[PDB]
Amino acid sequence: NLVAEPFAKLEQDFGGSIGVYAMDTGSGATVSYRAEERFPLCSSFKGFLAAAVLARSQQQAGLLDTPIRYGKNALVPWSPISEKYLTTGMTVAELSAAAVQYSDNAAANLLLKELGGPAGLTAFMRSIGDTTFRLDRWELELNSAIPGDARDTSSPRAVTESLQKLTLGSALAAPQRQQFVDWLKGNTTGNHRIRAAVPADWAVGDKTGTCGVYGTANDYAVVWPTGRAPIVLAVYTRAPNHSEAVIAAAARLALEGLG
Numbered sequence: 001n002l003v004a005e006p007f008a009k010l011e012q013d014f015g016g017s018i019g020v021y022a023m024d025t026g027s028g029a030t031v032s033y034r035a036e037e038r039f040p041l042c043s044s045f046k047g048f049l050a051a052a053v054l055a056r057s058q059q060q061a062g063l064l065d066t067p068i069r070y071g072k073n074a075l076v077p078w079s080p081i082s083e084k085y086l087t088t089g090m091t092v093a094e095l096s097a098a099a100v101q102y103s104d105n106a107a108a109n110l111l112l113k114e115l116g117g118p119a120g121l122t123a124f125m126r127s128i129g130d131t132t133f134r135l136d137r138w139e140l141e142l143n144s145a146i147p148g149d150a151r152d153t154s155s156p157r158a159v160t161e162s163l164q165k166l167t168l169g170s171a172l173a174a175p176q177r178q179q180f181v182d183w184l185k186g187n188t189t190g191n192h193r194i195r196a197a198v199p200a201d202w203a204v205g206d207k208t209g210t211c212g213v214y215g216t217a218n219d220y221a222v223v224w225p226t227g228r229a230p231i232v233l234a235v236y237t238r239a240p241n242h243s244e245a246v247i248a249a250a251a252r253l254a255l256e257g258l259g
C-alpha cells in the first residue's frame with residue numbers, strides 16, 4: 001500500500017494509467033506499479049529492434065556495414081535521418097542508430113523488413129525469454145494505441161527484464177551489448193523523461209516511445225549511478241480511457257524508493 005500510494009496519486013492527477021518497474025542490479029531491490037499490465041510499445045520497440053539486429057551480427061559477419069538502398073517509397077513522417085541520406089542510402093548500423101537515437105520511422109521499417117517483420121522481432125524477444133512482448137504492425141499503424149487492444153504491447157516488467165538481459169546480462173555478447181548501450185546512451189529524444197529524474201553526474205541510456213493518442217507515451221532506461229550498480233527501469237502510460245512530466249515524476253519516485 002505505502003509504496004503504491006505516491007504512484008496512485010500521480011496517476012490520479014494524470015488521468016490515465018501509469019506502469020512502472022525498476023530493478024537495482026546490485027541489491028536486487030525493485031519498485032513495481034501496474035508492472036504486469038500491457039501498455040502500447042509505440043516507438044520504444046525500436047530499441048529492441050536494434051538489439052535484434054545486433055544479435056544477428058553475432059552470426060552474419062559484416063551485417064552492420066551492409067548498405068541498404070532505399071527509395072522515396074520507404075519514407076514516412078518523422079524520418080529525419082533517412083530522408084537526408086536518400087541519395088547514398090544507409091548501412092544497417094546507420095539505420096539502427098537512427099531508429100534508436102532519433103526514433104526514425106523509415107529506418108525502423110527497413111530494419112523490420114530485414115528481420116522478417118513484426119513476427120521476426122517478436123520471435124527474437126521470445127528467444128531471450130520475453131513471453132510478453134508482441135509486435136504486430138509496422139510504422140505508422142503500430143501507434144494507434146486503441147484501448148484494450150493487445151497488438152504492439154508489452155509490460156513494464158517484461159520491458160525492463162529484456163532491457164537488462166540485453167545491456168547488462170547474457171542475451172548479447174559484450175561487443176554487441178556495448179554497441180546497444182552506446183546507441184541508448186546517445187539517444188536525443190529522452191531529455192524530458194527518465195533523464196530528467198536522475199542526478200547530473202549519473203549516466204543514462206534510454207529509448208522513448210510516443211503513440212497516436214495524447215497520454216500514451218513511455219521510456220525505458222539503464223541508469224549508471226556513481227559508486228553503485230546500474231538501475232534498469234521502465235515507465236509506460238495509457239491515455240485516460242502532460243505525459244512527459246508524469247513519466248519523469250514516476251521515474252523520480254522509483255529512484256527515490258528503490259533499495
Ligand SMILES: O=C(O)C[C@@H]1CC[C@H](NC(=O)Cc2cccs2)B(O)O1
Nearest residue numbers: 042043078103143189208209210211
Ligand atoms: O521516441 C518517441 O518518444 C518519439 C517517437 C516518434 C515516432 C513515433 N511516433 C509517431 O510517429 C507519432 C509521433 C509522436 C511524437 C512525434 S511523432 B514513436 O512512437 O515515438
Ligand SMILES: [Li+]
Nearest residue numbers: 199200201202
Ligand atoms: Li549537472
Ligand code: NA
Nearest residue numbers: 023160161164
Ligand atoms: Na530487471
Ligand code: NA
Nearest residue numbers: 169170171172
Ligand atoms: Na547481454
